[PDB]
Amino acid sequence: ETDICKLPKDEGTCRDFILKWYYDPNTKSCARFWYGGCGGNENKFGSQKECEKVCAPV
């Protein structure tokens, strides 16, 4: 599906931490990660449900 969903998990930098979700193409599912608030990429969603809608196969 879109190549944003295949970007690596990127915890980024800064210390304004928010728990986000990213799509893991190796499990074909979304997982949690901590984002520091700076320096991330777009494989980054506020909820598992939104990550799954955008990126999951099914």
- Is residue 22 within 8 A of residue 33, CB to CB? The reply is yes
CA distance 41 to 57: 21
Mention the CATH class of domain 1-58. Answer: few secondary structures
Resolution in A: 0.9
- Which residues are registered as beta bridge partners of 30? 23
Report the alpha-carbon distance of residue 12 to residue 8 in Å, rounded: 11
Please, are residues 17 and 35 in contact by the beta-carbon 8 Å criterion? yes
